[PDB]
Amino acid sequence: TSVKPIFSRDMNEAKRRVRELYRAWYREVPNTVHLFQLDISVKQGRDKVREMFKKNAHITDPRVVDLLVIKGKMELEETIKVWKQRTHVMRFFHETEAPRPKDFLSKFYVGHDP
Amino acid sequence: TYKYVNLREPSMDMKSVTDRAAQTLLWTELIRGLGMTLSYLFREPATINYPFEKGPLSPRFRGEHALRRYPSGEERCIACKLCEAVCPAQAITIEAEPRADGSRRTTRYDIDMTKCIYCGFCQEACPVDAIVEGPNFEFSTETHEELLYNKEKLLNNGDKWEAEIAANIQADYLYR
Amino acid sequence: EEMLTNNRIWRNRTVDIGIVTAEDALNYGFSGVMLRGSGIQWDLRKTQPYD
Amino acid sequence: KVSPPKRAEMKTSMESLIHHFKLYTEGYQVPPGATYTAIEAPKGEFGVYLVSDGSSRPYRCKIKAPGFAHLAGLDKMSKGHMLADVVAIIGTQDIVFGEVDR
Amino acid sequence: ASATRFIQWLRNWASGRDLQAKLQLRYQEISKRTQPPPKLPVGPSHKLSNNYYCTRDGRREAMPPSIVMSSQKKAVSPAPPIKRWELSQDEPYL
Amino acid sequence: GVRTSPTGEKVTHTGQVYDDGDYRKVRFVGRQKEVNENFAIDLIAEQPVSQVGSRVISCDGGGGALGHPRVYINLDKETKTGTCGYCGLQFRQQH
Amino acid sequence: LHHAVIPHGKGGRSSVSGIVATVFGATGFLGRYVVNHLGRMGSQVIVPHRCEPYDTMHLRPMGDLGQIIFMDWNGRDKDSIRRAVEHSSVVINLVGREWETQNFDFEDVFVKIPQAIAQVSKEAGVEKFIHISHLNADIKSSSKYLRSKAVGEKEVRETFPEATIIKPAEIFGREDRFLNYFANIRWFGGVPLISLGKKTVKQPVYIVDVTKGIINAIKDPDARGKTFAFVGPSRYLLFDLVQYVFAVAHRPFLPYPLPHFAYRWIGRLFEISPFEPWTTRDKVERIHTTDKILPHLPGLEDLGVEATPLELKAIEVLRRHRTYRWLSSEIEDVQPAKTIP
Amino acid sequence: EMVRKCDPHIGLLHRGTEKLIEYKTYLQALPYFDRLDYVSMMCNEQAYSLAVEKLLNIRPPPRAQWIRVLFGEITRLLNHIMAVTTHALDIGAMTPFFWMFEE
Amino acid sequence: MELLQVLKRGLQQVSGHGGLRGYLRVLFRANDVRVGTLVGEDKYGNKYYEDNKQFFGRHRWVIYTTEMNGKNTFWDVDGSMVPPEWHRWLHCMTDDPPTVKPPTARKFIWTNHKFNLSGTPQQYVPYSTTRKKIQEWVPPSTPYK
Amino acid sequence: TRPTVRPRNDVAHKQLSAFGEYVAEILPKYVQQVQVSCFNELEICIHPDGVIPVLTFLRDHSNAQFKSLADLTAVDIPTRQNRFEIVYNLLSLRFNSRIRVKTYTDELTPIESSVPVYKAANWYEREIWDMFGVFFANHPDLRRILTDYGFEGHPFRKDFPLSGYVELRYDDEVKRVVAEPVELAQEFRKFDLNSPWEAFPAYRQPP
Amino acid sequence: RGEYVVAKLDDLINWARRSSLWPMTFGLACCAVEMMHMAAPRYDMDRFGVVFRASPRQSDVMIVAGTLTNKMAPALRKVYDQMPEPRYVVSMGSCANGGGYYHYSYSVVRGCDRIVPVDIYVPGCPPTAEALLYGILQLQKKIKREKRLRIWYRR
Amino acid sequence: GSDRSRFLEGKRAVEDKNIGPLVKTIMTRCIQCTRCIRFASEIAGVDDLGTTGRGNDMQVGTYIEKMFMSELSGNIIDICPVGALTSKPYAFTARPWETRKTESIDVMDAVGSNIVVSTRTGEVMRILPRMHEDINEEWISDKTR
Numbered sequence A: 001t002s003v004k005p006i007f008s009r010d011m012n013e014a015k016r017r018v019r020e021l022y023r024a025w026y027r028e029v030p031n032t033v034h035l036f037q038l039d040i041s042v043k044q045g046r047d048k049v050r051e052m053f054k055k056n057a058h059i060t061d062p063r064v065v066d067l068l069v070i071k072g073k074m075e076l077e078e079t080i081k082v083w084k085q086r087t088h089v090m091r092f093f094h095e096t097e098a099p100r101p102k103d104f105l106s107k108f109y110v111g112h113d114p
Numbered sequence B: 001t002y003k004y005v006n007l008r009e010p011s012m013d014m015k016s017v018t019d020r021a022a023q024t025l026l027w028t029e030l031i032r033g034l035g036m037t038l039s040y041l042f043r044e045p046a047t048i049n050y051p052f053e054k055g056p057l058s059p060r061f062r063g064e065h066a067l068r069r070y071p072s073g074e075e076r077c078i079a080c081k082l083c084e085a086v087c088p089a090q091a092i093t094i095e096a097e098p099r100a101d102g103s104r105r106t107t108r109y110d111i112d113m114t115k116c117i118y119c120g121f122c123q124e125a126c127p128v129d130a131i132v133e134g135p136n137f138e139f140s141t142e143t144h145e146e147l148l149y150n151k152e153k154l155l156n157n158g159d160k161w162e163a164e165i166a167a168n169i170q171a172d173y174l175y176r
Numbered sequence C: 001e002e003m004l005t006n007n008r009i010w011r012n013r014t015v016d017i018g019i020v021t022a023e024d025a026l027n028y029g030f031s032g033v034m035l036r037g038s039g040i041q042w043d044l045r046k047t048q049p050y051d
Numbered sequence D: 001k002v003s004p005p006k007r008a009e010m011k012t013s014m015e016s017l018i019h020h021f022k023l024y025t026e027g028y029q030v031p032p033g034a035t036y037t038a039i040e041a042p043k044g045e046f047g048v049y050l051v052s053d054g055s056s057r058p059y060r061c062k063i064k065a066p067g068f069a070h071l072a073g074l075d076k077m078s079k080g081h082m083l084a085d086v087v088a089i090i091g092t093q094d095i096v097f098g099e100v101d102r
Numbered sequence E: 001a002s003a004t005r006f007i008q009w010l011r012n013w014a015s016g017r018d019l020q021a022k023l024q025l026r027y028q029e030i031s032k033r034t035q036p037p038p039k040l041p042v043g044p045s046h047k048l049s050n051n052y053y054c055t056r057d058g059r060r061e062a063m064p065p066s067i068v069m070s071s072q073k074k075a076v077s078p079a080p081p082i083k084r085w086e087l088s089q090d091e092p093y094l
Numbered sequence F: 001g002v003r004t005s006p007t008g009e010k011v012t013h014t015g016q017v018y019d020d021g022d023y024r025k026v027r028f029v030g031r032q033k034e035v036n037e038n039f040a041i042d043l044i045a046e047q048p049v050s051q052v053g054s055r056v057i058s059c060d061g062g063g064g065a066l067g068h069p070r071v072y073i074n075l076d077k078e079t080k081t082g083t084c085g086y087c088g089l090q091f092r093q094q095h
Numbered sequence G: 001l002h003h004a005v006i007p008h009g010k011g012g013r014s015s016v017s018g019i020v021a022t023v024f025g026a027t028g029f030l031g032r033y034v035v036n037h038l039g040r041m042g043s044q045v046i047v048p049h050r051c052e053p054y055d056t057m058h059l060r061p062m063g064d065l066g067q068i069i070f071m072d073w074n075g076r077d078k079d080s081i082r083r084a085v086e087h088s089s090v091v092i093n094l095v096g097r098e099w100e101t102q103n104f105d106f107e108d109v110f111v112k113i114p115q116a117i118a119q120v121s122k123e124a125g126v127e128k129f130i131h132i133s134h135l136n137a138d139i140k141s142s143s144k145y146l147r148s149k150a151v152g153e154k155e156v157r158e159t160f161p162e163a164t165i166i167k168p169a170e171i172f173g174r175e176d177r178f179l180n181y182f183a184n185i186r187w188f189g190g191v192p193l194i195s196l197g198k199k200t201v202k203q204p205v206y207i208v209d210v211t212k213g214i215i216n217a218i219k220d221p222d223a224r225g226k227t228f229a230f231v232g233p234s235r236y237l238l239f240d241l242v243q244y245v246f247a248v249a250h251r252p253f254l255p256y257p258l259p260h261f262a263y264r265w266i267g268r269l270f271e272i273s274p275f276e277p278w279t280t281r282d283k284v285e286r287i288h289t290t291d292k293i294l295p296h297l298p299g300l301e302d303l304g305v306e307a308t309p310l311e312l313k314a315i316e317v318l319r320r321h322r323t324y325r326w327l328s329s330e331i332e333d334v335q336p337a338k339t340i341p
Numbered sequence H: 001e002m003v004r005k006c007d008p009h010i011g012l013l014h015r016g017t018e019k020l021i022e023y024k025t026y027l028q029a030l031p032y033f034d035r036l037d038y039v040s041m042m043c044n045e046q047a048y049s050l051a052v053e054k055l056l057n058i059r060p061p062p063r064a065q066w067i068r069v070l071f072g073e074i075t076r077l078l079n080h081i082m083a084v085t086t087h088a089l090d091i092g093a094m095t096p097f098f099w100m101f102e103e
Numbered sequence I: 001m002e003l004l005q006v007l008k009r010g011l012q013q014v015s016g017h018g019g020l021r022g023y024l025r026v027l028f029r030a031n032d033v034r035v036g037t038l039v040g041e042d043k044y045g046n047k048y049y050e051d052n053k054q055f056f057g058r059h060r061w062v063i064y065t066t067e068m069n070g071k072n073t074f075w076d077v078d079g080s081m082v083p084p085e086w087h088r089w090l091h092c093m094t095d096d097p098p099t100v101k102p103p104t105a106r107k108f109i110w111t112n113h114k115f116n117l118s119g120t121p122q123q124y125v126p127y128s129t130t131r132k133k134i135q136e137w138v139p140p141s142t143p144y145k
Numbered sequence J: 001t002r003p004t005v006r007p008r009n010d011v012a013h014k015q016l017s018a019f020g021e022y023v024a025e026i027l028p029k030y031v032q033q034v035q036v037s038c039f040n041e042l043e044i045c046i047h048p049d050g051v052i053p054v055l056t057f058l059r060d061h062s063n064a065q066f067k068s069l070a071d072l073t074a075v076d077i078p079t080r081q082n083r084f085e086i087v088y089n090l091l092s093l094r095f096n097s098r099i100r101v102k103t104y105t106d107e108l109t110p111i112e113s114s115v116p117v118y119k120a121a122n123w124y125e126r127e128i129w130d131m132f133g134v135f136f137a138n139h140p141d142l143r144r145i146l147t148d149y150g151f152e153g154h155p156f157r158k159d160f161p162l163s164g165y166v167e168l169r170y171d172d173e174v175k176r177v178v179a180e181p182v183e184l185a186q187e188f189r190k191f192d193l194n195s196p197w198e199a200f201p202a203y204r205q206p207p
Numbered sequence K: 001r002g003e004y005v006v007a008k009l010d011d012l013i014n015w016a017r018r019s020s021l022w023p024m025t026f027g028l029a030c031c032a033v034e035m036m037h038m039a040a041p042r043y044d045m046d047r048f049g050v051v052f053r054a055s056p057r058q059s060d061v062m063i064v065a066g067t068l069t070n071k072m073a074p075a076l077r078k079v080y081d082q083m084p085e086p087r088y089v090v091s092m093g094s095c096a097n098g099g100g101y102y103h104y105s106y107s108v109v110r111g112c113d114r115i116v117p118v119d120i121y122v123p124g125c126p127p128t129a130e131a132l133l134y135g136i137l138q139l140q141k142k143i144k145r146e147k148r149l150r151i152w153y154r155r
Numbered sequence L: 001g002s003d004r005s006r007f008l009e010g011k012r013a014v015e016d017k018n019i020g021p022l023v024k025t026i027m028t029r030c031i032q033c034t035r036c037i038r039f040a041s042e043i044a045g046v047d048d049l050g051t052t053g054r055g056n057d058m059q060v061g062t063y064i065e066k067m068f069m070s071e072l073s074g075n076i077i078d079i080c081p082v083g084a085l086t087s088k089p090y091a092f093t094a095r096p097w098e099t100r101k102t103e104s105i106d107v108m109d110a111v112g113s114n115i116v117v118s119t120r121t122g123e124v125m126r127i128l129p130r131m132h133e134d135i136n137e138e139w140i141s142d143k144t145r
């Protein structure tokens, strides 16, 4: 189990890079809303950022964490430099997707998907 | 072997230097360029009077698709699905079953003309010359749905265009 | 060529514009006219010919 | 077994019909292997890295487009130049984005 | 082709070329649009004997790569150095 | 031949017709249902049976290499005709 | 169910919702959202239109291939109505106009046409019928628009007893004639208001809420024969609402009092226009009418829709009414309006 | 108007050609090469054909090889007309485009 | 002087179209006043002309009929009006006009050619040509239960 | 010289074999395999640690002089524990010769960036990262190059579906382009084409 | 009679609009090469009054000449929205029509009509330059049939 | 085999024979391998199939008009290497390359024969045996098929 690292020697160093990324995203949301003229609030933007970090909270491999951070920085740079358009920033909120209830009976009525 | 495109030293004699000064001051090479566009003004233009005149084409031209018949009126297609298999775009859809007289014939033959790349592979693959690309190229539509051809459309195309298609096949089948 | 080659406006727009050295062209992975414009004597039809 | 028979042969000979049938359905199989082949295309060296796994469909086909490397050099070539010179430089590279992007 | 003599002279002079000899519009020198039928030849494998496919089977002559080294004297180059190109004798300098 | 359903919609040569109550026939309102009129099953029946003097005849559809692959047809059964499996032409052995 | 209308798929563009809907008046403000939501889930939408086909082009991208069907119709040609509804399972009537014209008056578009559509639909076996009325419909109203809505709503309930009748308050959205109407008063300087807008209360509702309520009514068996009232979550004074509109748009707000007779006189001034009048006498009346409170009627929450506050969507409608200086201002920069508790 | 940095953002015509080819037979993949450098169509075909002919260990006949060089060079004329005249068109000289596109 | 001969040729074109009225008709219908040899006429009224001294592409042309299949085509013409037998000759796929090389007759070939019908009530509407795949159980019409 | 069979060239085969073992003698620390195909193409298979030492040697050595990086790409082979094969195709103008250098990595192991050796490698490594998700260490500017902004996944992996997971349309309600789960009106029709009869005995694997 | 007057005014505005169609200088892939050949001397689109103009503000027609990818879709919608009205869209070639050769790709929009409304579809891969011209003249005849003022009169 | 023919004669043609509603016979395709005869005799225990005549005229069949209606009859479709014996219900409906193979189990009885369910475009096209040495070997019953 001797593997070449990416950036972090262990989870302690990786969680430091995670916190650094979270700060960068957290500071950036106010500019993103302003620059892209989004009709959402800074609170919704930061709640969405928080929701994106939370879904990955269960990782324990430092290499996987490093790659998630690398992608997070790539995503942040795309946003800061306005390489993304408003459509890309808003794809995180899936505003046109209809609710898909997640209880057995609701799925049973609509189709065969488990 | 190679040649140099731009490797020449201008002559430094008095006549040459004064020739270049005249070119610089009197714009001789720019005047020469004006002569070329002037000569074109007095040439007959290359434009043709479409739609009263048409650009030339050959018998091999790949245009709108059609399903053909034998001289008896029977359909040529026997639902082998070679065209459907070879289609690079998967633009062909086929269903078949025994006909009421036991013939092997299609019940579905769709070509999605917005998927099709008009490559002619289907007519190469057909063993009986049932599916062809005809010579028509003026079938633009107002809606997307009008370009999803089913078997009725393709048979009507064959009946509509057979007179030209058969003459075109006659001209080129010895090259195939 | 009458319109462009000796035209002083054309030369002003293209002469000494976008100079690439032979060494840079090779390391950057250039090929074709992008190599031969800088003096590299290379053309796959001559050096690695086909049909 | 590689090139289809002539249509007249296909309609007379059993072997020709079988081979016509198989070439237009399964297609010819290629022996396993990998090649990088290039030509002097009009825009530069155009090549393919073609990996065959032994079947009738390629396993991998990487296309080397000469314009891909050329456009990567645009920033290098445009140093010290103005906007209108970048217009000229894009043209001198002779770029078509069908091959740059694939 | 219908240009009058004066117009022919005018554009000949302005261009500096005799444009009537190499017109860019096509007239009667092109091939007829109907042609006699062809009679294409057949290839070297169209024989009735001495033609066993196993003796002309390119695909079955391909072999796996030759393993030169695996982890299971003079210096060499990949090939001789490339010969220096010659200047063209048709037109060395443009 | 092309019949019409009790709703008036024409029946194709494949027997297709939207049934009474299928919403999908709204696509034809203000427009038309494309239906080829020359039914090949009826056309091939119009052809006469060809009388041949051999047990086995061959067919290529006519036109040489413009027809279909050449096949051979056995005419030993007298209770029926041999039919070309490609073009549907029919053959019989005279006495 | 006929096999062709059994739902299939995952509720997306290429799915089959099972809904075959004729939407009269699909070429207007409410129509484009209704047609958008039907086509999202793979419904078959029939769009009979009176307008020029150029004006229906924005509806074309809303459905997969073959799923939006256009027909010509005339509100007085009962045969043209039959052709458009005879294949559908639900008919939605969004027809209406905020001004009378030489050819069509409020009685035509709010009584005669809705009655004819309902009548033909019933005779054709159409099973569901959704008719849009107005929250403030009243036979005693001082507005002909609202008086005809009351009459038309009665005739619809008689011709098609099982109809769903929806009564929305003033609807706000990108293409509304509400928030956009107030913001466009700025070209006349001050903002006239009857009694300075202190006597009127409004409860505006978001366009998407009305749309989602219509779509749920189609799918809800309990919705048959009922009458709903679609109102927003908050009641505002007309003065506070218009003040909020000018704050969100960052335009100077100069309200002044104008008595009813004076406002009416100007309303006739703008009625002269043969095109689309900027305002009318009737429009002035409806804007200054108080939005009725109808506790006895079911509402958006009864159909599962959660009403969207005006505070969250006003910028979406009103950002384009600002100058370059204020274009980038964010949603939280303006303080909301006093809501009548 | 001085250029301090060029950052080409490409991919706006990325169509996953290389992934699509994995789902095609070698014949079915051939038309994808017409649509790469879509000004040098027959030259792209030749490069793909040479690669497949190399893996197959077969050789095309002499007449086909001469046709390929003939239409390869006609294709070079097509490419260079497009390259030179659009290059001139961008630089402001619009007239050569029209003369040479008749060719 | 050639400049005098050119005027005669241009003045001749007015008579070659049967007077000023016919000349102005072709000028406004086709934007071209050339006079060619009448190769033939199809059953819809289209007239086909050649002049082999014109350059390739301009040496064959059609003057479309003024009415086709009940449609007024005096001003509205389109290339899809050319019937298939003349289509081959007009596009130079063959040298022989159908007056000389008639097409082979078949009992299923359309006798009446149709132009592009998009945007009209005769337009093509796609549909599935196959029958229903699954037959559903129909419950009985009597209460036995 | 049978007319339909590609002719052999043993001289090139011999020259490339000799140079193959020349490279193996000089860089034994990194070279794992050397092979020459029957159509005369030389491949050096190396440990990934040797990317920079090996590529530098082939570029700069006087008997190699592979100055041009013709192509840099990756291949995905899911059955291998190191599923990604990294392939460098180099050209030597001096000796009119080509060479292929191959190494490997997995989803989580970085490969040293070869931009220091070849400036051409910059965009090629961005493409490999974009289409395969292989990370290149010390790349001056690593980011997607071909995929859409914010695109999730690496399409050229064998387990990425042909049509992906999302598709785009214009939505009038939000007045913008939106991304939604992919639905196809006509599913792509998978064909099973392989013949159940062996084609090439020369390549038969032992059982 | 108003009916007569509005009918004649319809003919005038329709005639002016179809006689002066200015497509946006906008092309995507190989179909754009055939669009160049329509502007080239043999067909000379300019002789019909059809003139390319680069700015969307000065364009009446968007010819979607080539494949529309997911990455390009927002920019195509942007420049279509920035065209003043009336505006028209001509879909040229299989890619723009419905995805074409790349229909099943993860990166391609399956038809530009998912992004913008389309007035004419020109089939082909690519359509010939003549085929595209046929499509432009078909658009002209569609504009000729418009009844904007006659419908307004009867509103 | 070779990639071409040198046979310049006419071919043999054989009359087809009706052996029941399940197996269609196109006996001109038969290559006289006798697999069907051996299967019928040994597996199915029915000595009804045989060869009549001799030489090039040798024919597989039942001689008289007979139906091969055994509970295992359909298997001869699988073991016939050519299209001489084919499934009548399956006739003309599909091609092998376009079917999706779902390996599944038969429920028509309690043996649990392993089967392949061939489907295409959402529809079941046919049933094939799946080899299981310890259950059904490579056969299925005709009810299963």
Ligand SMILES: CCCCCCCCCCCCCCCCCC(=O)OC[C@H](COP(=O)(O)OCCN)OC(=O)CCCCCCCCCCCCCCCCC
Binding pocket: B024, B025, B026, B027, B030, B031, C008
């Ligand atoms: C008794 C003693 C008498 C004393 C007086 C004697 C005076 C006469 C002798 C003096 C010389 C007279 C001629 C002077 C004309 C002006 C010359 C000039 O300025 O042009 C030179 C200019 C130089 O630019 P360039 O070639 O790029 O290189 C220069 C390096 N620094 O290059 C240019 O300007 C090029 C211009 C480019 C744009 C040209 C586009 C139009 C070209 C066609 C125009 C044709 C002329 C039309 C004139 C119509 C007038 C109605």
Ligand SMILES: NC(=O)C1=CN([C@@H]2O[C@H](COP(=O)(O)OP(=O)(O)OC[C@H]3O[C@@H](n4cnc5c(N)ncnc54)[C@H](OP(=O)(O)O)[C@@H]3O)[C@@H](O)[C@H]2O)C=CC1
Binding pocket: G024, G025, G026, G027, G028, G029, G030, G031, G049, G050, G051, G074, G075, G093, G094, G095, G096, G097, G098, G104, G109, G132, G133, G134, G135, G167, G168, G169, G170, G171, G172, G177, G178
């Ligand atoms: N604030 C609001 O918007 C509210 C609206 N409503 C009701 O909702 C419905 C639609 O609202 P909205 O969409 O805003 O109204 P719009 O005016 O925006 O659209 C009206 C629709 O009715 C059609 N129409 C109008 N007159 C006629 C006619 N004489 N013959 C045929 N069709 C006609 C129009 O077609 P064309 O495009 O041809 O004019 C258009 O499609 C109306 O009934 C309205 O009263 C209820 C409460 C509040």
Ligand code: SF4
Binding pocket: B083, B086, B087, B088, B089, B090, B091, B092, B111, B115, B116, B117, B118, B119, B120, B121, B122, B123, B133
């Ligand atoms: S022309 Fe090519 S893409 Fe079109 S249907 Fe035929 S095989 Fe398919």
Ligand code: SF4
Binding pocket: B076, B077, B078, B079, B080, B081, B082, B083, B084, B094, B122, B125, B126, B127, B128, B129, B130, B131
């Ligand atoms: S059109 Fe030809 S290739 Fe296609 S299924 Fe019919 S017979 Fe076979």
Ligand code: SF4
Binding pocket: H035, H038, K029, K030, K031, K032, K065, K066, K067, K092, K093, K094, K095, K096, K100, K101, K124, K125, K126, K127
């Ligand atoms: S439709 Fe054909 S020619 Fe046009 S962009 Fe697509 S592949 Fe290229």
Ligand code: SF4
Binding pocket: L029, L030, L031, L032, L033, L034, L035, L036, L037, L060, L079, L080, L081, L082, L084, L085
């Ligand atoms: S199994 Fe088939 S090929 Fe063999 S003898 Fe029986 S019918 Fe003939």
Ligand code: SF4
Binding pocket: D018, L029, L081, L082, L083, L084
């Ligand atoms: S598929 Fe096999 S059995 Fe059928 S005709 Fe061809 S070779 Fe004979």
Ligand SMILES: [K+]
Binding pocket: L076, L077, L078, L079, L080, L081, L082, L083, L084, L085, L086
């Ligand atoms: K069999």
Ligand SMILES: [Zn+2]
Binding pocket: F059, F060, F061, F062, F068, F084, F085, F086, F087, F088, F089
């Ligand atoms: Zn036959």
